[PDB]
């Protein structure tokens, strides 16, 4: 149950943030202003790369971002999957990226911030709204909460929702790279890195409470979680350390089961995982598994020092870990993982940290999980294909059949369109659906949640799985508001 990986791929910049673009599925990637380096002030524009899933083009560098150089900001796609970029080395600016005018197509602006800041959080909300809060790599001021109206391109200031409750107890950027989960009407749980976790409320001036501390778990900077069962409120959280820099990150592994707002989350710990990381990824898969990739013991910056190796693949039903194939290339601080629409899983990057720097990784990899295996692991198997769906854009509580090429017992899976970077990625989920077989097993029909606090608008992967848990390769769609 190892997988494997497939070929290095290398890429003009170091992909120290990367997105899926919706329908083509291909990867975009960007360091900053320069290919392989970064300054706090930037070089007010981005350097992009795109990776073509259908080819295998790596695309030339180009300055697809004139004016904001988007180097550790925060990141979240909008209920059109457009992909919203805030702050970084450009403190101030917000940018989109819209797939539908050309994925080489310029980034553009939108409203400045309230607020500028770096290596923030942002999220999509239920409302379909962009929460972003903290962020002390760049910026002035308390890094306050504030939202992003799409529909007036305006940013507000909500003053019940204070940075104060979230901050670190100790370290560097302790009020940074919050753990944001949008969760019902328009609420947002702070799951960490601080050991105290808080909701917040985007609606009118806001609001913010104490949702418990994340059981007995330290503060853990640079941890990972994921929201792997959005129907069921769970959240997996790893890792991370006390603070940014100088501490050993731990292998702590805990699952949070949210109920309302404002109400308390339920905490469980588990056995801990094989290796303590810090920077590492977390990537939900089709079937509801984490795999958790790279990061390092000791933490410190732009260093290939106390590398994990050996990632780790986590089953949340039986809250168990499997170590799978290692990597030779450390994955460290600036090193990302996304979820590809083929069921695979990228892993690269690591460094941006100047010309010849030995710590800079332009390449990774895609790795196969085991799901797309054979019983011997080593066997690649063979598929289902979704052969239509009824609609590629549906409101919460809508039907969708799904008609697959050969009949068979099969189960299904959303899994909402991300982007990553700094160990940050808001907008990954995975909702599990329940199929009606059509009465020939091809046809089954799903609902999408009906609370948007659970399916957030936007794009999501339709994965279907046969009844030896095979992903076909994933169809888009998107969940709209009304």
């Not at 901050?167 to 950027?173: A, E, T």
Request: charged share 15%.
């Amino acid at each position: 149950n190892v997988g494997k990986w497939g070929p290095m791929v290398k890429f003009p910049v170091v992909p120290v943030a990367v997105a899926l673009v919706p329908e083509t599925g291909n990867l975009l990637v960007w360091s900053s202003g320069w290919p392989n380096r970064w300054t706090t002030a930037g070089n007010g524009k981005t350097y992009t790369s795109l990776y073509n899933v259908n080819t295998g083009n790596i695309s030339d560098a180009i300055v697809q971002n004139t004016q904001h150089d988007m180097f550790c900001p925060g990141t979240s796609l909008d209920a059109d999957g457009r992909i919203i970029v805030t702050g970084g080395s450009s403190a101030a600016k917000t940018s989109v990226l819209d797939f539908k005018k050309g994925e080489s197509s310029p980034w553009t602006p939108l409203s400045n911030m309230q607020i500028s800041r770096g290596y923030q959080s942002s999220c999509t909300t239920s409302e379909g709204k962009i929460f972003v809060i903290g962020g002390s790599f760049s910026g002035a001021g308390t890094r306050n909460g504030e939202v992003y109206d799409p529909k007036a391109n305006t940013w507000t200031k909500l003053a019940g929702c204070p940075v104060k409750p979230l901050v670190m107890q100790r370290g560097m950027f302790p009020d940074s790279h919050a753990w944001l989960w949008s969760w019902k009407n328009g609420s947002v749980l702070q799951a960490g890195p601080s050991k105290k976790m808080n909701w917040y409320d985007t609606k009118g001036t806001g609001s913010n409470t104490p949702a418990g501390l994340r059981g007995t778990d330290e503060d853990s900077m640079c941890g990972v979680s994921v929201m792997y069962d959005a129907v069921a409120g769970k959240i997996f959280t790893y890792g991370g350390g006390k603070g940014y820099t100088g501490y050993d990150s731990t292998s702590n592994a805990h699952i949070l089961t949210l109920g309302e707002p404002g109400q308390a989350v339920q905490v469980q710990k588990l056995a801990n995982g094989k290796y303590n990381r810090g920077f590492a990824n977390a990537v939900v898969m089709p079937d509801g598994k984490i795999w958790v990739v790279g990061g390092m013991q000791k933490m410190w910056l732009f260093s290939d020092t106390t590398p994990q190796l050996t990632p780790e693949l986590f089953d949340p039903a039986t809250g168990s870990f499997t170590p799978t194939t290692p990597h030779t290339v450390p994955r460290n601080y600036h090193s990302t993982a996304l979820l590809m629409a083929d069921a695979t899983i990228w892993s690269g990057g690591g460094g941006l940290c100047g010309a010849n720097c030995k710590e800079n990784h332009f390449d990774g990899q895609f790795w196969s999980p085991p799901y797309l295996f054979e019983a011997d692991g080593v066997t690649p198997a063979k598929r289902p294909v979704i052969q239509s769906l009824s609609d590629t854009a549906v409101r919460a509580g809508a039907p969708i059949t799904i008609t697959m090429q050969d009949a068979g017992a099969y189960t299904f899976s959303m899994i909402r369109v991300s982007a990553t970077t700094h160990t940050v990625n808001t907008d990954q989920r995975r909702i599990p659906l329940d199929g009606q077989d059509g009465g020939d097993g091809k046809s089954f029909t799903v609902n999408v949640p009906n609370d948007y606090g659970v399916a957030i608008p936007g794009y999501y992967m339709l994965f279907a799985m046969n009844e030896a848990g095979v992903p076909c390769v994933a169809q888009f769609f998107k969940v709209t508001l009304h």
